[PDB]
């Protein structure tokens, strides 16, 4: 029952030329009914590519702020991101957390205020290498899901993402057991915490290195359900990734 | 000589579509003084619209950006981006970006030396909070920031330096004319002392913090004080009295 989850993070690339081309490409292509699509392009282009995207594609903000208007030079609102006719933010991604300083306590109640707003999340957690090494990965990605589960009440809007932070140019790489076993326990933490039915019915969605050769492999496995996909979000191997499943 | 008078709107997180179409249009039907320049900042989700619907007699401005042309940076935008987007300036150094968002001054100057390589103008700001203001170091507070903004500008005719008085912001503190004269007038000499007197003479110093339509003429005659950064106001018909402040 749980939808594969597709969701690309153009993070801060393109322009309106290269990335209206990508917009040609995923408009003509067949998206799988069995399939959700998201698309999150950089800020300034929320509103020109949720308008010359296809309805089939939804499209995400890649942060917010957690306040609907505000004194926030810099920052953007749910309520605009509506207003450019957007349904998704992404919140926590790693580069938040650790290029820009963005604590658990301000990711939850950016949570809280998206949900609130009306706005479907993508909320990310992952365990650096550090971290991984020492033995704290289920302590790490258990508590960030904490915070994310203390502000959300309808768990039909969220989507979790699972970021193997210490694959990130470290020298180490995730395997598709080791994504697994990480999403495996996440389900269960759905399911011990809050209910079963949100366990069974929550997509966890893989954010490491994903590739069309690597997909379906990696889609393949019982616990992941799709994906938060980077550099190939710019390409038509996205589309291979959006058929991982097929 | 004659530096040209400067007006920055700084709407912030502020509006949507339909209540930023209303200001634009008060904002187009306003008279311009050819004495003035006008820019606007809208929030980052409006930047194209804004340049859309705006009068081009009117520039627009981005809040803040990054200091690549493209990278794994969720949540940032470029230069590249804002220019994409017909908008040529962008704020940088922000005293929210600074306090709210924790911007080293490293970060700001980077981000600056970036934006001008791209071909973008900058409004950077600076300010001494508070505690800063009432220990007697609003000089070593504003010069060292000036100076991390100076040591990454090249061509000083497409820069904008933007006192904003932090201290004066949210604290149940008011900042005279006297007081901001007194800031602009050692910010003008740092540039002659550190960078050249053409510099010095010929880049706009502008005002930031709690310009109103009522106090705005009086700051506009300070000789030092160029123009204005204007936050609330901005968003208000008020605006248009702050651009017309020399008149």
Redesign the interface.
Known sequence: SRKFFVGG?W??????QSLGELIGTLNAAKVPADTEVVC?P???????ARQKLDPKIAVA???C?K?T?????????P???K??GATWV?LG?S??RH???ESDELIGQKVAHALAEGLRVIACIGEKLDEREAGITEKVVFEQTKVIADNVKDWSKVVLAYEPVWAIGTGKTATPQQAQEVHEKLRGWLKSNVSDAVAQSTRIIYGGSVTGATCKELASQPDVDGFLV?GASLKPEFVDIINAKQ
Not at 42 to 48: G, L, Q, S
Request: hydrophobic share 35%; charged share 20%.
């Open positions: 993070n993070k801060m690339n393109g322009r309106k999150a950089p800020t300034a282009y929320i509103d020109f903000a890649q942060n702020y306040v208007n505000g004194a926030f030079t810099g920052e953007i609102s309520g605009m991101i207003d450019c992404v991604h580069e938040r290029v820009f300083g980077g």
